[PDB]
RNA sequence: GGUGAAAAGAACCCCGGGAGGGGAGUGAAAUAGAGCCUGAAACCGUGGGCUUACAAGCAGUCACGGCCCCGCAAGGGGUUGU
RNA sequence: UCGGGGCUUAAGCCCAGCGCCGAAGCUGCGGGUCUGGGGGAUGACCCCAGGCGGUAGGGGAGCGUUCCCGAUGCCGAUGAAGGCCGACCCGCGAGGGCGGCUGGAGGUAAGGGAAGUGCGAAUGCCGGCAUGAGUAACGAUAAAGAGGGUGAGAAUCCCUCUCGC
RNA sequence: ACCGGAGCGCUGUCUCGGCGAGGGACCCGGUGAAAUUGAACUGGCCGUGAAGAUGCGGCCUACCCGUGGCAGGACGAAAAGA
RNA sequence: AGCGGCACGCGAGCUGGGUUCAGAACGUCGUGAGACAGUUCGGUCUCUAUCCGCCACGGGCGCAGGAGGCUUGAGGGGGGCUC
């Protein structure tokens, strides 16, 4: 009942090859350094998905704050108004409804102070 | 949808006074403009924030005892190469420096963070190279 | 067409002869040969040899005319390596590596139309 | 083999750079006057020859 | 294993001041042609199967064939000299075809002679009589006596 | 340790001191060409695409731009400017 | 040098009211997971409930392997196996399948059985190739010059002439 | 050819080293090792850390790569610490 | 005629004189092998720097017409004794 190793590790290690062929370093060839890079990349992918989340919240709030002080006042007060205006969500993301079309936003700012103030 | 990314907008130039102003507080404003944080479509990796020509920086105001206290430092790789200069002497000899130092540190550190420093020209005058537009600010 | 002279199983590590080759890669016969003679190397002898066998093929096997015949790809690759065993102090059987190589002058006529 | 050892295997990058300043230099040649073909600058080619032509004895 | 290798059992380089690993005898697996760890040595996989059980075994198996309906015990085989086409025409007449394989149960050697070289029909007969046969194959072709040998197998 | 069914195991021309090849000729096939069925990995080369000469690196990751090439669309590879 | 800067009716100090960011904690969504209830005898499957990190380890399940019964059979030159390419489909997963290029004659389903089974290491055993580096060294500090001859090729063989241990 | 101590003549042992000499090295020419080697795209202060960092951080000089030379660090190689 | 920090700096730089080797002797303890923060005399630190660091030297490049020569001095290095 022979159990000569054969070619399984060939196929599998080379699966790691294509799984990580593209990187830099000897590791971009080296079977055992490459896999360590595979760990690096995937782990990074996880942490970076959540990172991505907060990140995007930021971006929105950035341009939003800019335009809000521009055609009015600080972003915090715009929120305050809209939570009081009860305009559920508006999607701070889609608070980039200022990015395109000035009057949409501007109007909802007048609504912001309209609620409280 | 999918957040929008600005096209190659035309950099807008701006002019600022200086005299009577507070150093930090001044730069404080400069920086946020060297970037697009003032513009509604600010973008991180791009550099589209107004150029800023500042006039007569030779007369900027500074609180406390800075004038005699505040000491800038430079280090030549050489032993005992530490060189520290007081805000007092920085004005006398080439003062347009103070405002720059003050700002440079108030901008990102990466490649473009120096790229934006280039967008800022400061003159111990006033007077600038009246290149174009340059709408004075407050 | 394109002529080829190739040889395997032959001396000298790829380094030095590579040096000789890329000094003359993509150059006409007359020029490159005038180089081959005036070369402070043995790459003179080797490269000129294979190159010459390459030149002759185009003369009466490929047919191109040498007024137009310049040198294309020259590849030079390493064959085996002689694992010679040299002696040294305190009793080590040194391994000394004599890498053998693979020179290949390709070439062709001048124009296409 | 002593004290200052190449602590780690040097990269292929370093290989190719240290060998970047390597390279060759092409030969330098001019023509042979009162003849036809080359001769390196300041030479009396046997086939050809400088002024007055000395040697020129081959087959 | 390692002990049956025409090699030594002696160390080559030392213990501490070595610079290399530590073993010596080129016999253990770790090296090139080392011996094996346990396993592949001659053995016997067999064991004991209780009587009662295996009795029913045959019964069940054989009788289960009977549940299907593929079975018969001819009184006496017409091909009486043990020659191929005798049993062949005989089989074409006895409900056979070609695609169906024969625990051909019977006990007259001569009928089994054609069956000794039978490429579909394994030639099964009585003193051997197993369950694996009747499962692996097809025809209980019982001379009355083969079934007799089976009737006594159980007999309880 | 293995060329092929089998030696049919490569004459004659060509460069070359030979070696080795460029052709031809052979067989189904010379990517079976003589330690020659298979020929991978680490591995050293040559062509091409993208990128690099103000810049701080466990070498990737998330997004966006530049780009080149596959793509009917939609997309996809790739590559890296920040 | 407070983290850094750069603040002096504060960007510091303490004290009050409202604002907002900012955690995988929470709301939402929807796919998988196990355990309780229920619909379906209903198995399959769906609906309600909650937990949903984990070394040793306890427990369960699955992919992959060399071979044996199936196998007097099934697969295959329109090409076995394996080799290489995939931006394609199926599995949560290790994988399965399928197409492209190769190579040249082996492979074994559904059920089942058994074992040298799954390697990244052990200053690991064997093979293979680079790193160092075109560097150190080219083994007496008793020394070599030419003219010619030879020969595809000459300082290096050979002839003579010379000089030195 | 044993260990102290002292005087005489002499001297590059010392002050204070300068010149020259042949041979190594340095340039060309023919060949071509080694131990170490996870990979590296490998600079510095002030702190950080199981106490001693290019790599963490608040932060430094500087285009890319090389050659000669000195020897401080990589807790430096020789060992599975005498 | 300073006091001090930096592996009480610097044996991939020297020195290996002092140090805790085996030899031998001596004081000393032990019945003795031998051992004693007791002494004595002699006693093998190992040439090729890989990255960094540094001291000079260049090549390739760059300075958004190609080039030749005269230059600016921001920076930075050296310099500061005393009778």
From Swiss-Prot, chain B:
A GO-annotated cellular component: cytosolic large ribosomal subunit
Superkingdom of the organism of origin: Bacteria
Q: What Gene Ontology molecular function terms does this protein carry?
A: mRNA binding; structural constituent of ribosome
Alphabetized UniProt keyword annotations = Ribonucleoprotein, Ribosomal protein
* Pfam family name, one: Ribosomal_L13
Any GO BP annotation: negative regulation of translation
Q: Which family does it belong to?
A: Belongs to the universal ribosomal protein uL13 family.
Function, in words: This protein is one of the early assembly proteins of the 50S ribosomal subunit, although it is not seen to bind rRNA by itself. It is important during the early stages of 50S assembly.
Record NCBIfam families: rplM_bact
Query: How does the annotation summarize its subunit structure?
Result: Part of the 50S ribosomal subunit.
Q: What is this protein called?
A: Large ribosomal subunit protein uL13
State the organism named in the record: Thermus thermophilus (strain ATCC BAA-163 / DSM 7039 / HB27)
Query: What lineage is this protein's organism placed in?
Result: Bacteria, Thermotogati, Deinococcota, Deinococci, Thermales
Chain's gene name: rplM
UniProtKB/Swiss-Prot annotation, chain C:
Entry keyword set: Ribonucleoprotein, Ribosomal protein, RNA-binding, rRNA-binding
Q: Which GO terms describe its molecular function?
A: rRNA binding; structural constituent of ribosome
Q: Could you name the Gene Ontology cellular component terms for this entry? A: cytosolic large ribosomal subunit
What SUPFAM superfamilies does this protein's entry cite? Ribosomal protein L22 (SSF54843)
Q: Which Gene3D superfamilies match?
A: Ribosomal protein L22/L17
Question: Which one GO biological process term can you cite for this protein?
Answer: translation
Query: Sorted alphabetically, which PROSITE patterns does this protein's record hold?
Result: RIBOSOMAL_L22 (PS00464)
Enumerate the InterPro entries for this protein.
Ribosomal_uL22 (IPR001063), Ribosomal_uL22_bac/chlpt-type (IPR005727), Ribosomal_uL22_bac/org-type (IPR047867), Ribosomal_uL22_CS (IPR018260), Ribosomal_uL22_sf (IPR036394)
Quote the HAMAP family the UniProt record gives: Ribosomal_uL22_B
Role summary: This protein binds specifically to 23S rRNA; its binding is stimulated by other ribosomal proteins, e.g. L4, L17, and L20. It is important during the early stages of 50S assembly. It makes multiple contacts with different domains of the 23S rRNA in the assembled 50S subunit and ribosome.
Which family is annotated?
A: Belongs to the universal ribosomal protein uL22 family.
Question: Subunit structure of this entry?
Answer: Part of the 50S ribosomal subunit.
Q: What is this protein called?
A: Large ribosomal subunit protein uL22
Q: What is the scientific name of the source organism?
A: Thermus thermophilus (strain ATCC BAA-163 / DSM 7039 / HB27)
Swiss-Prot record, chain D:
- List the record's Gene Ontology CC terms alphabetically: large ribosomal subunit
Superkingdom, taxonomy of origin = Bacteria
Query: Which key words are in the record?
Result: Ribonucleoprotein, Ribosomal protein
Name one process (GO BP) from the record. Answer: translation
Q: Where is this region: Disordered?
A: 1-27
Family per similarity comment: Belongs to the bacterial ribosomal protein bL32 family.
Q: Which NCBIfam families match?
A: rpmF_bact (TIGR01031)
Chain's role: Found on the solvent side of the large subunit.
Name of the protein described by the UniProt record: Large ribosomal subunit protein bL32
Native source organism of the sequence: Thermus thermophilus (strain ATCC BAA-163 / DSM 7039 / HB27)
Curated annotation (Swiss-Prot), chain E:
Entire protein: which part is shown? 48 to 203 of 205
Query: Which keywords are on file for this protein?
Result: Ribonucleoprotein, Ribosomal protein, RNA-binding, rRNA-binding
**UniProt source species:** Thermus thermophilus (strain ATCC BAA-163 / DSM 7039 / HB27)
**This protein's GO CC annotations:** ribonucleoprotein complex; ribosome
Q: Which family does it belong to?
A: Belongs to the universal ribosomal protein uL4 family.
**A Gene Ontology molecular-function term?**
structural constituent of ribosome
Any GO BP = translation
This one is known as Large ribosomal subunit protein uL4
Sum up the protein's function in the record's words: One of the primary rRNA binding proteins, this protein initially binds near the 5'-end of the 23S rRNA. It is important during the early stages of 50S assembly. It makes multiple contacts with different domains of the 23S rRNA in the assembled 50S subunit and ribosome. Forms part of the polypeptide exit tunnel.
Q: How does it assemble?
A: Part of the 50S ribosomal subunit.
Q: Which residues cross the membrane?
A: none
